[PDB]
Amino acid sequence: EKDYLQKKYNELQEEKSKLEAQINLLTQSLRQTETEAGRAEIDKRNIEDQ
């Protein structure tokens, strides 16, 4: 039981590192997507002013 639980812990932490990396990636992606949407709004604003 101990050994099986330890193996499960190991694989579980492996997938945890995988998904933590993916989370960092996708959170940063959403950050930049939102910022660039706002900047696109700024760009339309400037063009319309012109």
């Binding site: 101990k2 639980l5 579980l12 989370i23 959403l30 660039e36």
Partner: protein
Amino acid sequence: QMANELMERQNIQQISDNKHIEEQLAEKKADVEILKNQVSAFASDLSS
């Protein structure tokens, strides 16, 4: 018998750590799906 008791206590502590990691992971995957959806939505917004 005593060694069995102590090692089973250690196993139970291992299980507690494992399930703590598991609930963390469930939160993480929920965040993953939510963030993918948010990225796609804001990308479509930016496309417009």
